[PDB]
Design an enzyme around this catalytic site. Structure first.
Site, PDB file in Angstrom:
ATOM      1  N   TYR A  40       0.831 -72.494  53.923  1.00 37.74           N
ATOM      2  CA  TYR A  40       2.572 -72.273  54.269  1.00 37.74           C
ATOM      3  C   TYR A  40       3.061 -71.533  55.239  1.00 37.74           C
ATOM      4  CZ  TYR A  40       3.335 -67.556  52.010  1.00 37.74           C
ATOM      5  OH  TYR A  40       3.382 -66.412  51.667  1.00 37.74           O
ATOM      6  N   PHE A  51       9.817 -65.560  58.508  1.00 38.31           N
ATOM      7  CA  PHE A  51       9.425 -64.316  57.880  1.00 38.31           C
ATOM      8  C   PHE A  51       7.940 -64.280  57.300  1.00 38.31           C
ATOM      9  CE2 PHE A  51      11.881 -67.072  54.654  1.00 38.31           C
ATOM     10  CZ  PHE A  51      10.693 -67.104  53.632  1.00 38.31           C
ATOM     11  N   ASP A  52       7.190 -65.341  57.053  1.00 43.66           N
ATOM     12  CA  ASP A  52       5.870 -65.178  56.721  1.00 43.66           C
ATOM     13  C   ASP A  52       5.113 -66.617  57.097  1.00 43.66           C
ATOM     14  OD1 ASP A  52       3.596 -65.175  55.202  1.00 43.66           O
ATOM     15  OD2 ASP A  52       4.443 -64.722  53.382  1.00 43.66           O
ATOM     16  N   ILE A  71       8.706 -68.504  43.074  1.00 41.47           N
ATOM     17  CA  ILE A  71      10.294 -69.083  42.939  1.00 41.47           C
ATOM     18  C   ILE A  71      10.097 -70.265  42.341  1.00 41.47           C
ATOM     19  CG2 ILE A  71      10.945 -67.295  44.683  1.00 41.47           C
ATOM     20  CD1 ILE A  71      11.154 -69.518  46.580  1.00 41.47           C
ATOM     21  N   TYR A  97      15.307 -66.607  45.511  1.00 42.10           N
ATOM     22  CA  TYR A  97      15.482 -65.373  45.056  1.00 42.10           C
ATOM     23  C   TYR A  97      16.837 -64.689  44.787  1.00 42.10           C
ATOM     24  CZ  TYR A  97      10.981 -64.778  47.170  1.00 42.10           C
ATOM     25  OH  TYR A  97       9.706 -64.905  47.406  1.00 42.10           O
ATOM     26  N   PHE A 114      10.323 -73.849  53.809  1.00 42.55           N
ATOM     27  CA  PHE A 114       8.940 -73.751  53.935  1.00 42.55           C
ATOM     28  C   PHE A 114       8.374 -74.870  54.369  1.00 42.55           C
ATOM     29  CE2 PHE A 114      10.077 -70.490  50.637  1.00 42.55           C
ATOM     30  CZ  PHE A 114       9.345 -69.387  51.218  1.00 42.55           C
TER      31      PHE A 114
HETATM   32  C1  LIG Z   1       1.804 -60.007  51.046  1.00 36.34           C
HETATM   33  O1  LIG Z   1       2.515 -61.199  50.874  1.00 36.34           O
HETATM   34  C2  LIG Z   1       2.888 -61.359  49.572  1.00 36.34           C
HETATM   35  C3  LIG Z   1       3.758 -62.803  49.380  1.00 36.34           C
HETATM   36  C4  LIG Z   1       4.954 -62.489  50.307  1.00 36.34           C
HETATM   37  C5  LIG Z   1       6.082 -61.532  49.521  1.00 36.34           C
HETATM   38  C6  LIG Z   1       7.491 -61.883  50.348  1.00 36.34           C
HETATM   39  C7  LIG Z   1       7.888 -63.470  50.398  1.00 36.34           C
HETATM   40  C8  LIG Z   1       9.255 -63.310  51.143  1.00 36.34           C
HETATM   41  C9  LIG Z   1       6.750 -64.122  51.021  1.00 36.34           C
HETATM   42  O2  LIG Z   1       6.827 -63.656  52.349  1.00 36.34           O
HETATM   43  O3  LIG Z   1       5.482 -63.989  50.385  1.00 36.34           O
HETATM   44  C10 LIG Z   1       6.921 -65.661  50.985  1.00 36.34           C
HETATM   45  O4  LIG Z   1       6.839 -66.486  51.879  1.00 36.34           O
HETATM   46  C11 LIG Z   1       7.421 -66.113  49.571  1.00 36.34           C
HETATM   47  O5  LIG Z   1       8.697 -66.293  49.405  1.00 36.34           O
HETATM   48  N1  LIG Z   1       6.597 -66.653  48.612  1.00 36.34           N
HETATM   49  C12 LIG Z   1       5.072 -66.428  48.717  1.00 36.34           C
HETATM   50  C13 LIG Z   1       4.544 -67.760  48.618  1.00 36.34           C
HETATM   51  C14 LIG Z   1       4.892 -68.503  47.436  1.00 36.34           C
HETATM   52  C15 LIG Z   1       6.464 -68.558  47.198  1.00 36.34           C
HETATM   53  C16 LIG Z   1       7.069 -67.302  47.394  1.00 36.34           C
HETATM   54  C17 LIG Z   1       6.981 -66.520  46.222  1.00 36.34           C
HETATM   55  O6  LIG Z   1       7.286 -66.811  44.910  1.00 36.34           O
HETATM   56  O7  LIG Z   1       6.511 -64.921  46.290  1.00 36.34           O
HETATM   57  C18 LIG Z   1       6.206 -64.257  45.183  1.00 36.34           C
HETATM   58  C19 LIG Z   1       7.700 -63.532  44.954  1.00 36.34           C
HETATM   59  C20 LIG Z   1       7.870 -62.710  46.044  1.00 36.34           C
HETATM   60  C21 LIG Z   1       7.739 -62.667  43.768  1.00 36.34           C
HETATM   61  C22 LIG Z   1       7.840 -63.582  42.270  1.00 36.34           C
HETATM   62  C23 LIG Z   1       9.026 -64.617  42.509  1.00 36.34           C
HETATM   63  C24 LIG Z   1       9.054 -65.350  41.194  1.00 36.34           C
HETATM   64  C25 LIG Z   1       9.253 -64.215  40.111  1.00 36.34           C
HETATM   65  O8  LIG Z   1       8.921 -65.104  38.623  1.00 36.34           O
HETATM   66  C26 LIG Z   1       7.968 -63.356  39.754  1.00 36.34           C
HETATM   67  O9  LIG Z   1       8.097 -62.277  38.863  1.00 36.34           O
HETATM   68  C27 LIG Z   1       6.920 -61.792  38.288  1.00 36.34           C
HETATM   69  C28 LIG Z   1       8.108 -62.678  41.085  1.00 36.34           C
HETATM   70  C29 LIG Z   1       5.247 -63.472  45.381  1.00 36.34           C
HETATM   71  C30 LIG Z   1       3.845 -64.276  44.991  1.00 36.34           C
HETATM   72  O10 LIG Z   1       3.498 -65.464  45.028  1.00 36.34           O
HETATM   73  C31 LIG Z   1       2.593 -63.466  44.478  1.00 36.34           C
HETATM   74  C32 LIG Z   1       1.293 -64.287  44.477  1.00 36.34           C
HETATM   75  C33 LIG Z   1       2.967 -63.381  42.946  1.00 36.34           C
HETATM   76  C34 LIG Z   1       3.708 -62.281  42.125  1.00 36.34           C
HETATM   77  C35 LIG Z   1       3.907 -60.870  42.913  1.00 36.34           C
HETATM   78  C36 LIG Z   1       3.801 -62.171  40.658  1.00 36.34           C
HETATM   79  O11 LIG Z   1       3.808 -63.714  40.111  1.00 36.34           O
HETATM   80  C37 LIG Z   1       3.033 -61.528  39.760  1.00 36.34           C
HETATM   81  O12 LIG Z   1       3.595 -61.538  38.619  1.00 36.34           O
HETATM   82  C38 LIG Z   1       3.255 -60.297  37.628  1.00 36.34           C
HETATM   83  C39 LIG Z   1       1.638 -61.942  39.814  1.00 36.34           C
HETATM   84  O13 LIG Z   1       1.399 -62.594  38.739  1.00 36.34           O
HETATM   85  C40 LIG Z   1       0.506 -61.737  40.862  1.00 36.34           C
HETATM   86  C41 LIG Z   1      -0.408 -62.809  40.958  1.00 36.34           C
HETATM   87  C42 LIG Z   1      -0.220 -60.267  40.553  1.00 36.34           C
HETATM   88  C43 LIG Z   1      -1.010 -60.093  41.766  1.00 36.34           C
HETATM   89  C44 LIG Z   1      -1.489 -58.786  41.536  1.00 36.34           C
HETATM   90  C45 LIG Z   1       0.035 -59.619  42.907  1.00 36.34           C
HETATM   91  C46 LIG Z   1       0.007 -60.366  43.893  1.00 36.34           C
HETATM   92  C47 LIG Z   1       0.838 -60.231  45.371  1.00 36.34           C
HETATM   93  C48 LIG Z   1       0.725 -61.016  46.445  1.00 36.34           C
HETATM   94  C49 LIG Z   1       1.720 -60.690  47.470  1.00 36.34           C
HETATM   95  C50 LIG Z   1       1.838 -61.621  48.533  1.00 36.34           C
HETATM   96  C51 LIG Z   1       0.668 -62.533  48.945  1.00 36.34           C
END
Ligand SMILES: CO[C@H]1C[C@@H]2CC[C@@H](C)[C@@](O)(O2)C(=O)C(=O)N2CCCC[C@H]2C(=O)O[C@H]([C@H](C)C[C@@H]2CC[C@@H](O)[C@H](OC)C2)CC(=O)[C@H](C)/C=C(\C)[C@@H](O)[C@@H](OC)C(=O)[C@H](C)C[C@H](C)/C=C/C=C/C=C/1C
Length: 125
Positions: A40, A51-52, A71, A97, A114
């Site tokens: 993506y 942004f990503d 999301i 968000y 996206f």
């Molecule tokens: C470095 O890059 C980041 C991703 C970035 C963050 C900032 C955004 C602009 C962005 O650039 O992605 C982006 O493009 C974006 O908007 N994304 C990522 C692609 C999927 C769609 C969206 C999204 O929902 O991000 C997500 C968004 C930011 C936050 C979530 C939004 C939905 C809401 O219900 C959730 O509540 C919990 C929070 C980030 C993610 O896709 C990651 C994978 C998932 C989480 C962090 C949570 O689900 C968490 O909940 C405990 C988990 O179960 C995870 C697996 C636990 C492990 C240890 C953490 C892994 C973290 C990985 C972080 C990564 C790769």
């Protein structure tokens, strides 16, 4: 039409444009709980800035479909995708968000764009 435009919520909050058609059949659409693997890139509509792009080329992004991990607009979009489909999806803030926004670049009331490519998916035991 050049591309199929698919309204995924009736309120216009999530709209998908299919850039490349994926594989036909229900077996090629991921189901709730499956691990899905995608590429993506994300862009902010208000500024027009990407942004990503970290997962746009060689590095795959993996998540569990419809498991509260991403999301809402992403769950809605990816649940409609066929294996190998590439789409553009426009996600209004209600399905992104919301008021909180995310990080330094994404304010409240943001529309996100996206490009997503669904590479594969698998059922967990
Ligand atoms: C470095 O890059 C980041 C991703 C970035 C963050 C900032 C955004 C602009 C962005 O650039 O992605 C982006 O493009 C974006 O908007 N994304 C990522 C692609 C999927 C769609 C969206 C999204 O929902 O991000 C997500 C968004 C930011 C936050 C979530 C939004 C939905 C809401 O219900 C959730 O509540 C919990 C929070 C980030 C993610 O896709 C990651 C994978 C998932 C989480 C962090 C949570 O689900 C968490 O909940 C405990 C988990 O179960 C995870 C697996 C636990 C492990 C240890 C953490 C892994 C973290 C990985 C972080 C990564 C790769």
């Amino acid at each position: 039409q050049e591309f199929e435009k698919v309204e995924l919520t009736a309120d216009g909050g999530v709209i998908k444009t299919i850039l490349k058609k994926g594989d036909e059949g229900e077996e090629n659409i991921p189901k709730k709980g499956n691990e899905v693997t995608v590429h993506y890139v994300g862009k902010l509509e208000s500024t027009g800035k990407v942004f990503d792009s970290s997962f746009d080329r060689n590095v795959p992004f993996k998540f569990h479909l419809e498991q509260g991990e991403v999301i809402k607009g992403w769950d809605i979009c990816v649940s409609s995708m066929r294996k190998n489909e590439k789409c553009l999806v426009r996600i209004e803030s209600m399905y992104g968000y919301g008021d909180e926004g995310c990080g330094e670049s994404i304010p409240g009331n943001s529309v996100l764009l996206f490009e997503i490519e669904l590479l594969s998916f698998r059922e967990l035991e």
